Design a protein around this nucleic acid. Sequence first.
RNA 1: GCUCGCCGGAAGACCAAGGGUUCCUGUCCAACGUUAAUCGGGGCAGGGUGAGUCGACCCCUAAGGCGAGGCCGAAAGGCGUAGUCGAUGGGAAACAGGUUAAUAUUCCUGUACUUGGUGUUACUGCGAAGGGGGGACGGAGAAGGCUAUGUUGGCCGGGCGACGGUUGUCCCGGUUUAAGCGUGUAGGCUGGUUUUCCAGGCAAAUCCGGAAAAUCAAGGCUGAGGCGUGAUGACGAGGCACUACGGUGCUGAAGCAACAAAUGCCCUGCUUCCAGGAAAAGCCUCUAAGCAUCAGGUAACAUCAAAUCGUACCCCAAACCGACACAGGUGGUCAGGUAGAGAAUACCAAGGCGCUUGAGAGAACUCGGGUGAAGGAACUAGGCAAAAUGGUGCCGUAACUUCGGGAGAAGGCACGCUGAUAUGUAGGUGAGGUCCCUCGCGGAUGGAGCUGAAAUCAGUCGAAGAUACCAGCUGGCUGCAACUGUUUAUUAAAAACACAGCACUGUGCAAACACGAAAGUGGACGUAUACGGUGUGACGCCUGCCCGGUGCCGGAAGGUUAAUU
RNA 2: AGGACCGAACCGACUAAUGUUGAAAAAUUAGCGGAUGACUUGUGGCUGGGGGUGAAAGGCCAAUCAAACCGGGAGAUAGCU
Lengths: 93, 271, 46
Amino acid sequence: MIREERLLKVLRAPHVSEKASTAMEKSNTIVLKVAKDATKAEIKAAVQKLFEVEVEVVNTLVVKGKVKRHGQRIGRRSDWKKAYVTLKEGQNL
Amino acid sequence: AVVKCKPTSPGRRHVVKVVNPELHKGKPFAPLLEKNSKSGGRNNNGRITTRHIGGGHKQAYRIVDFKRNKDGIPAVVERLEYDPNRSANIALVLYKDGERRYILAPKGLKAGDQIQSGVDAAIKPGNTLPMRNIPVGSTVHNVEMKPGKGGQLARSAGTYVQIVARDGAYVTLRLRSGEMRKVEADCRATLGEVGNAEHMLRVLGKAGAARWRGVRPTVRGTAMNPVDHPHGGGEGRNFGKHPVTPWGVQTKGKKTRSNKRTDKFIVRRRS
Amino acid sequence: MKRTFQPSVLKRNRSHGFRARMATKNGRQVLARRRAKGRARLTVSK
RNA sequence: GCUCGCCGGAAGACCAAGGGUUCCUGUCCAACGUUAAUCGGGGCAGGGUGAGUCGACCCCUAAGGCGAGGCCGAAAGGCGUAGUCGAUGGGAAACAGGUUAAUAUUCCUGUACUUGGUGUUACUGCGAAGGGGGGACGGAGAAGGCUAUGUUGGCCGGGCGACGGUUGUCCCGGUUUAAGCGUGUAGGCUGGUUUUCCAGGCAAAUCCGGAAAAUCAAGGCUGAGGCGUGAUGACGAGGCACUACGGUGCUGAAGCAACAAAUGCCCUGCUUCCAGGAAAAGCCUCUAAGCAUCAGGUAACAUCAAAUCGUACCCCAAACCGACACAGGUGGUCAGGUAGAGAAUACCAAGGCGCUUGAGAGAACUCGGGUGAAGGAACUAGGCAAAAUGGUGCCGUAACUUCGGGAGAAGGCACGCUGAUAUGUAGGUGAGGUCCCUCGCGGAUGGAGCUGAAAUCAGUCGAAGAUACCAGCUGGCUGCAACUGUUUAUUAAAAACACAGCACUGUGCAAACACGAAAGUGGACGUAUACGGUGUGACGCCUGCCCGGUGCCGGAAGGUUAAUU
RNA sequence: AGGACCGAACCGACUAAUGUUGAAAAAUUAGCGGAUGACUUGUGGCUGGGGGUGAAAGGCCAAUCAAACCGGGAGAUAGCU
Ligand SMILES: [Mg+2]
Ligand SMILES: [Mg+2]
Ligand SMILES: [Mg+2]
Ligand SMILES: [Mg+2]
Ligand SMILES: [Mg+2]
Ligand SMILES: [Mg+2]
Ligand SMILES: [Mg+2]
Ligand SMILES: [Mg+2]
Ligand SMILES: [Mg+2]
Ligand SMILES: [Mg+2]
Ligand SMILES: [Mg+2]
Ligand SMILES: [Mg+2]
Ligand SMILES: [Mg+2]
Ligand SMILES: [Mg+2]
Ligand SMILES: [Mg+2]
Ligand SMILES: [Mg+2]
Ligand SMILES: [Mg+2]
Ligand SMILES: [Mg+2]
Ligand SMILES: [Mg+2]
Ligand SMILES: [Mg+2]
Ligand SMILES: [Mg+2]
Ligand SMILES: [Mg+2]
Ligand SMILES: [Mg+2]
Ligand SMILES: [Mg+2]
Ligand SMILES: [Mg+2]
Ligand SMILES: [Mg+2]
Ligand SMILES: [Mg+2]
Ligand SMILES: [Mg+2]
Ligand SMILES: [Mg+2]
Ligand SMILES: [Mg+2]
Ligand SMILES: [Mg+2]
Ligand SMILES: [Mg+2]
Ligand SMILES: [Mg+2]
Ligand SMILES: [Mg+2]
Ligand SMILES: [Mg+2]
Ligand SMILES: [Mg+2]
Ligand SMILES: [Mg+2]
Ligand SMILES: [Mg+2]
Ligand SMILES: [Mg+2]
Ligand SMILES: [Mg+2]
Ligand SMILES: [Mg+2]
Ligand SMILES: [Mg+2]
Ligand SMILES: [Mg+2]
Ligand SMILES: [Mg+2]
Ligand SMILES: [Mg+2]
Ligand SMILES: [Mg+2]
Ligand SMILES: [Mg+2]
Ligand SMILES: [Mg+2]
Ligand SMILES: [Mg+2]
Ligand SMILES: [Mg+2]
Ligand SMILES: [Mg+2]
Ligand SMILES: [Mg+2]
Ligand SMILES: [Mg+2]
Ligand SMILES: [Mg+2]
Ligand SMILES: [Mg+2]
Ligand SMILES: [Mg+2]
Ligand SMILES: [Mg+2]
Ligand SMILES: [Mg+2]
């Protein structure tokens, strides 16, 4: 039983974009920004308990941060985790 | 069974092969097999310490019974087999109690023959006895040096040892080298000679044949520079010096044995 | 033609990596020298 | 956009390594791009990488590494046992269709499969660090049976032709379907079963190994492909409608056969040879300590779980190694048509490109090529370079020889197209039909249809029929080296090195010898028919004299002679 | 059968021309040798500088080799320019 605090930690932000929106309309999938060390089970439990929604499967990928340049200085953005989590055709979050 | 190849190609013209139809054409007895990877003449420091070793065919090691300490139980020769690890052929024997072992195949030992080891075994080729129990003048092979240690003398193809005399707890033996050596009379010996005596009649025929056996080429010292051999140097072919090893030791007639511990067991040197 | 540097991450890590340096006192002297100089990158590991 | 040209065993597609956002979209043209640039692998901003089944991770080990104690060493350290790591190798499981600007075996649809944990039912002897089996293994060679794939016919849809002809023996296109499950086939291997005993497998074993009985005569395992199902589905030419002109949506015929056929599969097979061809685990089986109306195992069902990391993009290259957007280097897989022996070669398909300065002119000279009167090596150090030869079939072929060769010696003849033999032959493949049985993926016969060389005779066109690309120059005397190999990466490929063979010599095993102050290790899990060193260098005929000098081997009467006393 | 024969891939490097501030700090083009073996190639591993490795050219040991490279003794010494 994953604790309340861990569940409250593992969710960070929704992922807003064209592909995420299309997943929402078509496959009933919401796309999330989650913690880097958050596992599929933790994401599922947190989504179920805080969004009050029923979940069937969680797909995860890690995004590699981009190396950009700020005034001749090298600088890199952080890696992050993105979750494709599918809702079971009755909740419409 | 010594047969020469027809000269269909320059590398076949001089080849002479020894082929035994008596040998087993199938796979060896698996439970008596072990792996032995190759060294290439390199020691545990990784340095070359014996030259001219490398490459060659993969070989599996056959566990061979050099002790023959399973006295009392008879055995039958099941077949003869090719052994890549040695010149001599090996024989698979089945003991009547159900155990199988490899032994060096002596001259004349064929499938179906019986063998036995012990103090009370008959004097016939293949049987092992203490030399205390073997008549003086018997041709033996696979001779122990220390009791219970296993055969160490006369193991190559075609070799044997002559039991010359027996006085005290010691027997005088004549070795293949011509040396006369005293060994303790409790040391076991197998009657007869080692088989495959035609092994020395083979002609390799080509350089690749020596390469298949894991021998790498030998470079004459006189053909290199003085920095890396005592024989090196010269404008054209020159020698002008006494022949030595790559390490400077005279290599035509200088004796190198120095073992005072075993000097007492040598009756006469090979000369 | 075939030049001298043929990259391989595994071989590079095993030859010059942090674990390899730490495995001998001479390698630890290399690390001590590079820390004393102030190197931003001690080894090829990162 | 329409023409043109180039690659197509790549200049196409996909893995691994390596790189790391170069991927996609919007915007910008300062600097970068060998020119311009509206363009870019450039700048700036956003987006994009979805797995129980792919890989890593993980279980198991090779070479090798590290290494508790240990052995050794001024110190630092070296080596190594029990162990523990280490893939380039062994070990469970997923396919087809569809979808984005950029991911897909990961997403959706449909159909599957593996492993484990829990609950129950029924039955029951379970239990390992141990035993046994298995995993588990080389080169070459040969068929046979298949498939990928191709071509042709049939079928379906469309067409009737810019210029003579084209309702046909005509033109164009399509004719696709998996894993899984069921079947156990061409073929490969092995004789089974129930008894009684036993110096073996460290003890035990009912398992393996050995000894004997009786009985039985067919049991067992393995295995491509095919067929049925999967699939009344999906895909499908084209057609109807828009289009923001990028594309979107609906509908949807035929969807069969014959023949040819791999270097892929059966095949970790079979035949054969000598140079004699990993390990460990998973897996199966056997018991010991020990638990024993419990545990624990087997089978059926229910349920839950299969985490984490990688997944964009280049990848024979403008993204990797070469300072460059550099004519260089870079392991594996895929493998269409015509001709062809072919993965050569020429032209093409799918697909991908015109190589990031152009425009004129038509001097010398330079580079890369074509042709050349008469002569034909006169050139030159030297035929350097060029020119020439070049295929298949048949005929024919010398000295010499180690009897294999020399040899493709040399030299010569035929070669296209059409018809007949023969409406398409020899041969190959083979449907029906009939017959039979231990009934099926069975045998005998039968031969329709399909495919199909080569030869002969006769005609026929050209200067020329191996017409292009492709593709030996040949012969004579002689030095050296026997030969195949190797070498001065980057001026030397050779007569130099090596070699099989020969000889001398050392070495009795704790071998000699080598690497190590040592412990150890190699030699070698070898044992004188073996191992090291040295010289010579296939083979043939052979290898003469000198031991004064130097070295090495043996001897110790005498002389001299150290530490020591 | 074969360190057998012709010939692609693949490995090499005999001749010539070009190039020589190169397209390239060793290549290109046309020819050339081997091409089932003493063959070739991937991945990983071992051998360390008076040392290794070497079918032996003083070859090679990261475009460096009759003694690698880096740091130190070090401002070696220089009757020489
Ligand atoms: Mg899923
Ligand atoms: Mg993932
Ligand atoms: Mg030797
Ligand atoms: Mg020799
Ligand atoms: Mg020389
Ligand atoms: Mg010297
Ligand atoms: Mg001379
Ligand atoms: Mg002289
Ligand atoms: Mg073309
Ligand atoms: Mg960028
Ligand atoms: Mg782009
Ligand atoms: Mg510009
Ligand atoms: Mg860009
Ligand atoms: Mg210790
Ligand atoms: Mg160690
Ligand atoms: Mg180990
Ligand atoms: Mg391990
Ligand atoms: Mg691996
Ligand atoms: Mg893509
Ligand atoms: Mg077919
Ligand atoms: Mg092949
Ligand atoms: Mg991709
Ligand atoms: Mg360069
Ligand atoms: Mg360019
Ligand atoms: Mg390039
Ligand atoms: Mg290559
Ligand atoms: Mg081609
Ligand atoms: Mg001109
Ligand atoms: Mg010209
Ligand atoms: Mg010309
Ligand atoms: Mg003309
Ligand atoms: Mg002329
Ligand atoms: Mg003329
Ligand atoms: Mg003439
Ligand atoms: Mg002349
Ligand atoms: Mg002249
Ligand atoms: Mg002249
Ligand atoms: Mg020429
Ligand atoms: Mg020419
Ligand atoms: Mg004809
Ligand atoms: Mg002359
Ligand atoms: Mg030669
Ligand atoms: Mg040659
Ligand atoms: Mg050179
Ligand atoms: Mg050269
Ligand atoms: Mg030893
Ligand atoms: Mg010589
Ligand atoms: Mg000679
Ligand atoms: Mg050959
Ligand atoms: Mg040849
Ligand atoms: Mg070379
Ligand atoms: Mg070339
Ligand atoms: Mg060839
Ligand atoms: Mg160099
Ligand atoms: Mg020096
Ligand atoms: Mg000083
Ligand atoms: Mg100075
Ligand atoms: Mg002076």
